[PDB]
Amino acid sequence: MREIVHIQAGQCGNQIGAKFWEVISDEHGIDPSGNYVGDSDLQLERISVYYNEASSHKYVPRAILVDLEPGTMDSVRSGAFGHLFRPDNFIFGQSGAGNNWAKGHYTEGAELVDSVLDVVRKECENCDCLQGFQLTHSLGGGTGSGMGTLLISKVREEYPDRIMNTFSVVPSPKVSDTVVEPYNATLSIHQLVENTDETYCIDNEALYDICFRTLKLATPTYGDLNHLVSATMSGVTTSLRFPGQLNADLRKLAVNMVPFPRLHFFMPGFAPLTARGSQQYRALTVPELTQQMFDAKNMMAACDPRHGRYLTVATVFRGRMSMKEVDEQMLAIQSKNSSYFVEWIPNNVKVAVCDIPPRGLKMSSTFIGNSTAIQELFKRISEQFTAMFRRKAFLHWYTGEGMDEMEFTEAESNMNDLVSEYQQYQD
Amino acid sequence: MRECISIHVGQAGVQIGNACWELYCLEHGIQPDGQMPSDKTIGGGDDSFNTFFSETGAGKHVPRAVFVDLEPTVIDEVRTGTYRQLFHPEQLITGKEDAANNYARGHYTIGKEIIDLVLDRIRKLADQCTGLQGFLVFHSFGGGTGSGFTSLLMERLSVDYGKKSKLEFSIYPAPQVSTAVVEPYNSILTTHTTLEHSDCAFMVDNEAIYDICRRNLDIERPTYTNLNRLISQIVSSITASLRFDGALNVDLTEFQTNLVPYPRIHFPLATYAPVISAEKAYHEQLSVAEITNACFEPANQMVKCDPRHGKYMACCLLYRGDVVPKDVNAAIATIKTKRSIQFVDWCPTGFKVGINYQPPTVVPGGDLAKVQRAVCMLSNTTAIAEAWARLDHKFDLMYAKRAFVHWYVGEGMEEGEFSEAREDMAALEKDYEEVG
Ligand SMILES: COc1ccc(C[C@@H]2NC(=O)/C=C/C[C@@H]([C@H](C)[C@H]3O[C@@H]3c3ccccc3)OC(=O)[C@H](CC(C)C)OC(=O)[C@H](C)CNC2=O)cc1Cl
Numbered sequence: 072m073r074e075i076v077h078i079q080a081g082q083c084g085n086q087i088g089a090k091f092w093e094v095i096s097d098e099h100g101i102d103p104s105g106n107y108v109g110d111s112d113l114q115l116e117r118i119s120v121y122y123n124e125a126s127s128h129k130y131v132p133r134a135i136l137v138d139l140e141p142g143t144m145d146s147v148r149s150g151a152f153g154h155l156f157r158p159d160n161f162i163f164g165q166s167g168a169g170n171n172w173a174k175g176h177y178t179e180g181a182e183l184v185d186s187v188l189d190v191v192r193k194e195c196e197n198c199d200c201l202q203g204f205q206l207t208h209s210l211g212g213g214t215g216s217g218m219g220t221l222l223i224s225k226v227r228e229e230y231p232d233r234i235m236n237t238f239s240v241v242p243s244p245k246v247s248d249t250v251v252e253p254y255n256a257t258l259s260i261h262q263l264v265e266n267t268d269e270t271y272c273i274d275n276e277a278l279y280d281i282c283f284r285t286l287k288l289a290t291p292t293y294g295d296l297n298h299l300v301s302a303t304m305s306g307v308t309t310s311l312r313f314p315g316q317l318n319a320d321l322r323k324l325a326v327n328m329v330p331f332p333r334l335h336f337f338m339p340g341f342a343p344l345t346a347r348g349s350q351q352y353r354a355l356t357v358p359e360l361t362q363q364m365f366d367a368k369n370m371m372a373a374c375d376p377r378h379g380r381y382l383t384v385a386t387v388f389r390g391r392m393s394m395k396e397v398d399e400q401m402l403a404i405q406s407k408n409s410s411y412f413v414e415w416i417p418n419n420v421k422v423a424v425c426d427i428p429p430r431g432l433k434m435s436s437t438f439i440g441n442s443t444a445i446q447e448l449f450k451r452i453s454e455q456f457t458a459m460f461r462r463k464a465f466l467h468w469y470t471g472e473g474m475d476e477m478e479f480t481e482a483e484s485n486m487n488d489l490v491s492e493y494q495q496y497q498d
Numbered sequence: 499m500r501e502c503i504s505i506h507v508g509q510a511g512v513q514i515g516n517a518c519w520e521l522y523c524l525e526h527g528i529q530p531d532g533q534m535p536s537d538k539t540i541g542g543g544d545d546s547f548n549t550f551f552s553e554t555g556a557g558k559h560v561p562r563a564v565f566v567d568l569e570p571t572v573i574d575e576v577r578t579g580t581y582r583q584l585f586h587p588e589q590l591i592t593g594k595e596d597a598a599n600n601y602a603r604g605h606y607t608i609g610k611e612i613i614d615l616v617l618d619r620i621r622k623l624a625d626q627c628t629g630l631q632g633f634l635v636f637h638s639f640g641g642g643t644g645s646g647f648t649s650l651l652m653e654r655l656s657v658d659y660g661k662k663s664k665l666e667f668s669i670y671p672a673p674q675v676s677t678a679v680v681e682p683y684n685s686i687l688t689t690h691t692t693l694e695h696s697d698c699a700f701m702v703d704n705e706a707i708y709d710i711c712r713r714n715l716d717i718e719r720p721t722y723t724n725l726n727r728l729i730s731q732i733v734s735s736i737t738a739s740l741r742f743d744g745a746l747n748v749d750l751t752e753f754q755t756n757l758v759p760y761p762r763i764h765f766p767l768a769t770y771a772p773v774i775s776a777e778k779a780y781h782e783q784l785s786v787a788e789i790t791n792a793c794f795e796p797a798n799q800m801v802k803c804d805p806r807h808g809k810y811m812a813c814c815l816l817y818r819g820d821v822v823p824k825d826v827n828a829a830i831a832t833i834k835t836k837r838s839i840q841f842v843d844w845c846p847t848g849f850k851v852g853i854n855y856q857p858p859t860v861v862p863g864g865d866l867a868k869v870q871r872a873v874c875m876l877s878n879t880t881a882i883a884e885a886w887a888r889l890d891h892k893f894d895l896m897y898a899k900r901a902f903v904h905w906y907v908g909e910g911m912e913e914g915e916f917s918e919a920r921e922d923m924a925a926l927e928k929d930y931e932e933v934g
Pocket residue numbers: 168169170171172174248249250251465466468469751752755756757758759811812842845846
């Protein structure tokens with residue numbers, strides 16, 4: 072039972088992670104009090120990886136929540152699992168998360184992260200075995216990225232023989248405002264690349280473009296985003312939570328998935344996307360499910376995979392259907408869409424099936440891809456930063472608290488390097 | 499708790515300080531005694547107005563601010579005025595020799611021999627307070643005091659307090675009330691030595707205010723009383739955000755962030771719609787949409803410039819009383835319909851809005867007509883180029899004839915230094931020209 076320590080920080084990170092944890096607990100059926108009220112014994116067979124044990128035999132999920140605005144538990148209790156997290160490790164800041172990198176990444180907050188690292192180190196050893204670390208946040212500026220990549224650097228320092236993972240969200244100038252973020256993102260990911268190899272780029276722009284246009288919305292609120300993300304990035308780890316064919320561990324997930332030590336930006340999707348409606352819907356069929364699988368609109372990234380090629384694909388079906396027939400349409404897709412995949416990497420279709428269905432849904436399937444497609448999103452975020460770097464806007468605070476211009480230029484150089492790598496490996 | 503300190507240098511500065519401070523004391527329900535609004539009456543308040551006034555034992559709400567000039571002409575003239583006991587006696591400094599329109603006089607002759615006392619007093623005042631945020635500067639370009647002493651003082655402040663922001667309320671000078679022809683010289687000599695220390699500056703234009711007091715306020719010979727009262731009203735209409743409640747543009751840092759892209763360029767335009775004159779009873783009525791759409795008109799723009807011919811960079815507003823957001827958004831949408839306004843090609847340029855729950859308070863015995871609606875646009879329009887280039891042109895006309903140079907030279911300036919400053923501000927004009 073290789074346990075996982077969950078790291079989590081930031082206003083958006085906590086918002087997404089609360090609903091994610093609620094979804095996973097509900098699917099596993101443990102009561103919001105913290106006791107097993109599930110409906111079978113296939114739940115607690117090895118699930119200690121996410122849920123530890125208390126003295127009174129009640130379970131206890133392990134996940135750290137930190138920030139720099141003092142009120143987090145005041146906002147963490149906004150759902151249904153406030154006291155559920157152990158009530159001694161809600162380390163809180165003092166100021167807030169203005170969109171200022173290095174205001175958490177160099178001087179203040181960095182003072183707090185030493186104690187944070189001490190606490191997480193103390194937290195880790197109690198388990199029987201360690202799997203690694205995985206982190207949920209957004210690349211959003213304002214203590215959201217600083218603390219994130221900072222703690223990434225120190226955890227990678229302390230445990231080189233484990234695996235990182237980021238559930239970060241790329242900001243976008245369609246849903247949001249306070250436009251200094253391109254700096255924050257394109258600078259933090261600049262060392263996220265060297266510091267981590269396991270990433271999911273849930274494009275907020277794509278989430279809006281699919282949630283407001285063709286999902287019957289008028290003003291997408293933050294809970295609206297939280298529904299879709301707490302669906303997809305909660306179903307992404309069912310393979311970890313549930314035994315099955317592709318039980319691959321973090322290290323093994325990587326070795327099956329990441330060819331090169333940098334080209335590791337997975338772009339996920341989820342075929343039965345659903346806005347918040349209590350009624351489930353009419354039923355869907357397996358070929359329809361696996362066809363909405365590659366729905367370009369369905370993609371949680373900013374591209375249509377038809378416009379590019381894949382490298383290493385996974386898939387996790389869920390429900391009760393034809394177990395052994397899924398290979399038929401897997402090979403059908405392979406045969407009719409050879410151009411979509413690449414010849415450099417044969418048999419890039421690792422597939423598996425999980426018996427359990429999700430909450431409020433019978434037939435569904437979480438998806439993971441790895442394609443050249445995210446070159447489009449990176450070109451977007453690179454132009455949406457370079458077209459404004461010429462005016463040197465707002466770099467006063469950054470240049471005052473400990474950055475410099477050469478750092479900005481070298482970050483742009485690194486990201487042009489990544490887009491070049493994607494381009495050439497597409498060529 | 500938080501707090502802020504407003505400095506007052508120069509005759510014009512201290513006149514506007516008296517007018518503004520009396521208006522502010524009136525507005526909050528405070529009185530020339532400051533008995534009590536509704537609070538603990540000793541170390542009370544707890545609303546935003548405490549950031550200006552602090553209660554003594556009597557709950558007097560003493561305004562922790564000082565007034566400075568180099569001649570006991572005006573300082574005393576108001577020290578025995580209406581607010582004799584409002585401020586602390588022996589907390590208003592009086593110089594001896596007037597700077598006499600000589601920038602070097604305030605920079606290396608007399609202000610340099612007294613600035614230590616001012617520094618001691620302001621540092622003691624800061625020790626008295628606990629929640630200092632920054633500084634509010636009331637000075638003028640033309641005067642020797644309000645330029646040289648201003649620059650040297652703020653240099654000392656930036657040396658010792660290198661973190662807090664600061665806001666400058668200067669007065670752009672006009673020929674029609676000009677009391678010198680060395681006025682562009684002092685203006686350049688001070689402003690060329692501000693950017694390195696200045697954070698944001700609200701400069702007001704004498705000719706603009708004069709045209710406001712006449713063409714709409716029904717005056718023909720406005721004294722310093724009329725112009726000063728009107729500019730005190732507009733300054734209150736600006737700072738009401740800091741005065742009352744959490745809304746758009748609460749903090750000085752928030753001010754500059756919402757306003758200042760690039761540190762060198764921190765001169766934002768300002769407007770305030772109600773300039774309706776006086777006891778003239780009623781020719782029409784008021785409306786939120788009316789005043790909001792008429793705000794864009796060049797009528798009330800604090801400094802004479804042509805905004806419609808220049809690309810914008812941001813837009814903030816503020817409203818007094820009669821709150822309802824819906825018609826405010828409707829008015830924004832109506833004015834949003836891109837008649838000729840433009841914006842920045844690389845960032846969102848929304849019309850940020852923060853409303854306030856109190857109608858404007860008018861002086862009990864003055865010209866302004868009571869109203870209840872208001873707007874206050876702190877537009878960061880690039881079109882202040884025109885005015886700066888006009889002042890620079892008026893400057894370099896008189897440099898081929900080496901006019902008046904010796905007068906500044908005699909106290910420790912340099913002749914070629916003026917050329918360096920002129921090139922600095924030619925480059926600043928180029929910087930405005932860059933945005934296109
Ligand atoms: C053309 O100029 C413009 C002016 C305004 C706008 C819109 C305007 N803003 C920006 O894109 C400016 C971003 C900068 C950023 C700088 C680079 C980071 O170090 C900052 C910092 C943070 C905390 C403490 C100390 C320093 O600051 C800020 O984080 C603050 C927020 C608060 C905390 C003051 O600023 C805003 O965001 C304001 C208040 C919210 N509103 C806006 O949507 C657009 C343009 Cl293009």
